[model samples]
Target: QKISRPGDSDDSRSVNSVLLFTILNPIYSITTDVLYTICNPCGPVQRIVIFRKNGVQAMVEFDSVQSAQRAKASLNGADIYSGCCTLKIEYAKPTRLNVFKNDQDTWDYTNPNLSGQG
Candidate 1:
């Protein structure tokens, strides 16, 4: 689940081994391809890990560190996909496979969980 970014430091100690942890956010279900398309329209997307239980939540993995950084800079808080929602991008923990393994049922994109915070 922890995808390595391109141009990661070769030191194997410093930036080389940058690990990002995944969280159960409300936007993880968003696919990495979709995120990359919206977040990095100019770059090719590598991977995407969404919080299956959390609607509109996910972790996007790009081919390079520069691209990832660019995504963070440009797409963060920008409107994407449906055009009704704005992304909340940030440096998150590396994507974890376990977090998204068995939570598929929780993420029903068509009928999201909007029971509170109204």
Candidate 2:
């Protein structure tokens, strides 16, 4: 399931560079930073696609086909979290996946010393 789009021309790889939905929630968290950290070894992720209201799955888009290929070769069917969660690699069929360009993450240390605070 690979998306037919630009970015890969005169080459069999690189075509819009989308990897299919792989189950990676063994260590559960869809924050881009978490995704980035988890998939770091795979390659430099351009961005990750995570679904809302779904404890289901996610995908990684490597900026380089070489890197993607490297990831695909190594990570497919491997347990990502050491928790018996299997990882599968496949090309995504969506040509253009939307990424939030203006979103931000906020932190609260408002109660830094309180195990008594909720």
Candidate 3:
């Protein structure tokens, strides 16, 4: 059966693996690995891409929709640490994330052979 959750964009329903995650008032110490560790236990994460233009944000892609659901359900509004890195998870538009290299900013667990060094 089809399931539905809170929408992010114009869509009224949302239930997908790709999440537009936000780290409110994030600390400088946050990295791809740290975010991965936070979301790993929730489900099988496929890829993660971090952006630090103004604040820390990430796009998390999970292997399954159920996994994504669990993450948003459990992690939304949760803090990465005791008093900072507040997590704001919501359904994203894309179904998948492209990780060109596995590095401190992006990671593609589906492909382990990719190199991070340039």
Candidate 4:
């Protein structure tokens, strides 16, 4: 397995293509919609998972690797809000995201049958 590092020079190459993206610097208590709107413009989002450990962090699964690249290229270091909440984007370890339910914090757009308070 290739180790993921902040200074990996070849992480952007096609061989390193990854569909799942890890995002950082989001607003505290960030919602699914907040992440979805940012990623949706990059490509069709399959799912999103948010967690707040060190800070508001999230994982977004795109429809394809190319879409993930698009997000990284443009949104990486981009602001998620007015002069705040910078978006730090990186390829995630997982190939896909898992969402137990569609809710305000996590969403699985591919499945409509999943029930939650979104």
- Each candidate's clash count: 12, 1, 0, 0
- In order, what lDDT does every prediction score? 0.45, 0.58, 0.82, 0.72
- What is the C-alpha local distance difference test score of candidate 1? 0.45
Question: What's every prediction's RMSD, in angstroms?
Answer: 12.0, 10.7, 6.3, 7.9
Q: Please estimate how well model 4 matches the true structure, expressed as its whole-model Cα lDDT.
A: 0.72
Listed in order, each prediction's TM-score against the native is 0.48, 0.58, 0.80, 0.74
Write the residue-wise lDDT of candidate 4 on 19-92 in tens digits. Answer: 43344444444688888898788888888877766666778877778788787888887876666676777777
The digit string of per-residue lDDT tens for model 1 on 12-98 reads 332211123233333423454355457447344444545544344666555556566656666655665445456676665544222
Q: Write the per-residue lDDT of candidate 3 for residues 1-118, one digit (tens) a residue.
A: 5458754666435556789988877675877798889889999988888888987788888888878888898899998777877889888887677889888888888886865558
lDDT, residue 68, candidate 1 = 62
Number of clashing pairs, model 2?
1
Candidate no. 2 TM-score: 0.58
Q: Candidate 3 versus the native: TM-score?
A: 0.80
Q: Which ten residues in a row have the lowest lDDT in candidate 3?
A: 6-15
What clash pairs does model 4 have? none
Model 3 gets an lDDT of 0.82
TM-score of 4: 0.74
